[PDB]
Design a protein around this nucleic acid. Structure first.
Lengths: 127, 50, 127
RNA sequence: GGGGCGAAAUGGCCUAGACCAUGCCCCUUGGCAAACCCAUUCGACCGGGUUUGGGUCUUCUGACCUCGUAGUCCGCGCUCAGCGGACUUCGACCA
């Protein structure tokens, strides 16, 4: 199969390939309960008349709850669902330096503290 | 032959599981057939040759 | 993934599996520019009422051109496209010796100098 | 009673055509498998009646035993029980 190791800071999570297919790659995290866990959908295709390409990356994670610790009967039930999709439209005949600069800019914007505040405190981005 | 049950709203037994009260059936038969038709016109004539 | 090594005489080309599917296998050659390269499409199926089979093999290769070496500005553009498809209709209940003889005859006809002249000089086959 | 048919058997009409007469096709639903009761040679003897028949927790929605029905990836490995196992669905007194 295919294993992906993600470092959160103090622990390491492992995602395993489940549904190996060209037009749809489904990775699922293996920790405990398989239902309501971390899933990742990847897709790659073309467009128009063999001009550019199209890449789609979605990451879902639904929280679960259980009452068997106190209540005497409740199966693990999912609560909410989060969807974080992507869309990559990069042409083939481009520039490696430009692609590297764009990737570095995206990494910097992701690692910056403004997007973290926008996600947590729901404050619009503008510092 | 076919059979379809009938269930009503929360009623009977003071329950609410949409219980079955009866059943309705339908019995029949299927058949296939073929046919041919023929149409012909004929012209008749006479004569008293002598 | 699945690698195929082809010997041209002085160099070795490598084709990599990209779209792994039963009804359509797409192999792509990895050398440099992925767009406008060597591609191979393979398909296998049945026919009628479980009698024989059907195999299809197509090989495409589109040439590319670029002007960035002299001209200011020109993305790599494809020129012509070549299509070389196949069709294999071999029944299951056949003969291994007959199939081997047919394969040897096909290999000899491919390696002969008449088909090479027919391809290059466009002269009809007849020596 | 409710329908069907001009087909299919013939007769009117009878290039053709569409309708007619007798005339021919179906429903009168059906089955539960168990446990107990009578008067007496004060049971042998056939026949009848009553309680149950996929089942419970809140059989309200919804779940917990069971299976049946499908679709999907599936393992060629990780887990003390182990194992071949996963997820989503519709049904469950019987023809």
């Amino acid at each position: 199969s295919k294993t992906i190791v993600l470092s959160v800071g103090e622990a390491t999570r492992t995602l395993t390939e489940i549904q190996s297919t060209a037009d749809r790659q489904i990775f699922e995290e293996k920790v405990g309960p398989l239902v309501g866990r971390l899933r990742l959908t990847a897709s790659l295709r073309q467009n128009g008349a063999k001009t550019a390409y199209r890449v789609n990356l979605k990451l879902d994670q639904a929280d679960v709850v259980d009452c068997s610790t106190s209540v005497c009967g409740e199966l693990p039930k999912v609560r909410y669902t989060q969807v974080w999709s992507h869309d990559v439209t990069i042409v083939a005949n481009s520039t490696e330096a430009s692609r590297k600069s764009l990737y570095d800019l995206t990494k910097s914007l992701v690692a910056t503290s403004q997007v973290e505040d926008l996600v947590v405190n729901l404050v619009p981005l503008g510092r | 032959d076919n059979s379809v049950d009938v269930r009503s709203y929360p009623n009977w037994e003071r329950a609410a599981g949409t219980r079955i009260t009866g059943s309705v059936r339908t019995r029949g038969v299927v058949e296939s057939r073929a046919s041919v038709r023929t149409a012909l016109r004929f012209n008749l004539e006479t004569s008293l040759a002598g």
